[PDB]
């Protein structure tokens, strides 16, 4: 948890309906994006974060926590973006003998900065007299290791948590859900997804001369009314469907 | 207990051998990774294959013998790997190592056996 | 996947110095690494695993250091016995790698 992986996510499409048997008894509460609509999105930069804690220690992965994994192993922005997961690992992570190989930090100077990282394994000065090195009394090694004990509760197992960090954008998009790419149609009233763009209106050819990195096009009302095609670099206008009243 | 190994000898080049790594004092339980590494006489420590001896094994190979050497376990205390095809930088000392956590791969290798000369000649 | 070197290659010092080696990794291994230490003729003998944690019946003079990429082992005293050769091992992913041990590092202990 200390010495957590990063990884980076981009130019290609990520689905998530996979991530069922791959992390049996996952747990993908998170925030910022409601979690039902993360398939029609695109995703501009992603960031994954993986380590391993224990179970009574997963509350701990949230925005504005506090505690000895939020202060001094990984901590999180206050406007945090992104959705964490957690699924039980005993079957993966538990080792008759003892699974000494984890490690925590315990003593820290000062409580970390949202994402940072804290490899120094210098001696930890608990009292007056300087350490010189000797691990006495007050005088500790940072870095613990878990002990864990699956005879209790789950609160003493070994739970794997995968962090992915988001941006949100929908125009420059690299990381898009795992939804197909539909055929156009045009002069028909259809509902549309543009890189995460979703309107009804009908679509038709236009003659608006965007600049080479113009995106999108607005209205008097701040609302989409012209936009380019991921796919082919077209230009096209959105126009409502016909309504009015009745009489 | 100890981890001797043999079958270790003077080879014609482009013919086969089988090593067999034998344990003394304990059986290969499932929870040990019972793994497979070979020194050159001058250089560095190498890895070459690595079989679980467990429920089902989960065997594993190095990049440059992919294909060339195959390791098997062969009874409850004997593990052979065989290789086809011995050139003339395949001479070695080949040690049989025991690892110490079952993560489908070469942990920590707390136990070491002896190790045997095997030389490739004309 | 990932492959790493040992440098420096030799190293020499009085009996009184501190030999320094450092191993570092094309990608980061977080904890996973040990240090194994070879005399000539004998099979090798593991030293630090956990990049931390000193083996059983090792004296308390070799350090490991450094998590991620870069990892430095530290021997605070040499008494002549300790001229030999050693290794970095990556324990974290074998499934396609060409050698999880790193280089040789052989010290010489000028006494």
């Known amino acids: 948890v200390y010495a957590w992986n990063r990884k980076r996510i981009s130019n290609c499409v990520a689905d998530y309906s996979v991530l069922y048997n791959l992390a049996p008894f996952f747990t993908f509460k998170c925030y910022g994006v409601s979690p039902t609509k993360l398939n029609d999105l695109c995703f501009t930069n992603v960031y994954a974060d993986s380590f391993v804690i224990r179970g009574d220690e997963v509350r701990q992965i949230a925005p504005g926590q506090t505690g000895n994994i939020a202060d001094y192993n990984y901590k999180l922005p206050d406007d945090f973006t992104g959705c964490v997961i957690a699924w039980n690992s005993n079957k993966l992570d538990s080792k008759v003998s003892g699974n000494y190989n984890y490690l925590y930090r315990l003593f820290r100077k000062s409580n970390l900065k949202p994402f940072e990282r804290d490899i120094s394994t210098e001696i930890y000065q608990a009292g007056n007299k300087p350490c010189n090195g000797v691990a006495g009394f007050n005088c500790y090694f940072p870095l613990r290791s878990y002990s864990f004990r699956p005879t209790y509760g789950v609160g003493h197992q070994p739970y794997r948590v995968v962090v992915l960090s988001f941006e949100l954008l929908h125009a420059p998009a690299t990381v898009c859900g795992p939804k197909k790419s539909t055929n156009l149609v045009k002069n028909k009233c259809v509902n549309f997804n543009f890189n995460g763009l979703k309107g009804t209106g009908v679509l038709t050819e236009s003659n608006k001369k965007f600049l080479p990195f113009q995106q999108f096009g607005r209205d008097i009302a701040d609302t989409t009314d012209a936009v380019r095609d991921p796919q082919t670099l077209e230009i096209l206008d959105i126009t409502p469907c016909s309504f009015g009243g009745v009489s | 207990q100890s981890l001797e190994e043999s079958g270790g000898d003077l080879v014609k080049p482009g013919a086969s051998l089988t090593l067999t790594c034998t344990a003394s004092?304990?059986?290969?339980?499932?929870?040990?990774?019972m793994c497979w590494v070979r020194q050159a006489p001058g250089k560095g420590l190498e890895w070459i294959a690595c079989?679980?001896?467990?429920?089902?094994?989960?065997i594993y190979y190095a990049s440059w013998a992919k294909g060339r050497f195959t390791i098997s376990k062969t009874s409850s205390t004997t593990v052979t790997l065989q290789m086809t095809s011995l050139t003339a930088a395949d001479t070695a000392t080949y040690f049989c190592?025991?690892?110490?956590?079952?993560?489908?791969?070469?942990?920590?290798?707390?136990?070491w056996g002896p190790g045997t000369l095997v030389t490739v000649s004309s | 996947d990932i492959v790493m070197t040992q440098t420096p290659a030799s190293v020499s010092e009085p009996v009184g110095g501190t030999v320094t080696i450092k191993c570092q990794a094309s990608?980061?291994?977080?904890?996973?690494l040990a240090w194994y230490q070879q005399k000539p003729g004998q099979p090798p003998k593991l030293l630090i695993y956990?990049?931390?944690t000193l083996a059983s019946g090792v004296p308390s003079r070799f350090k490991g250091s450094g998590s991620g990429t870069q990892f430095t082992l530290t021997i605070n005293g040499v008494e002549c016995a300790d001229a030999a050769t050693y290794y970095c091992?990556?324990?974290?992913?074998?499934?396609?790698?060409?050698?999880?041990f790193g280089g040789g590092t052989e010290v010489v202990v000028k006494g």
């Open positions: 956990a990049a931390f």
């Open positions: 190592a025991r690892d110490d956590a079952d993560y489908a791969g070469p942990d920590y290798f707390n136990l």
């Open positions: 004092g304990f059986s290969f339980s499932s929870g040990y990774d």
């Open positions: 990608e980061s291994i977080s904890n996973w």
């Open positions: 091992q990556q324990t974290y992913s074998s499934r396609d790698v060409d050698n999880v």
């Open positions: 079989i679980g001896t467990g429920s089902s094994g989960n």
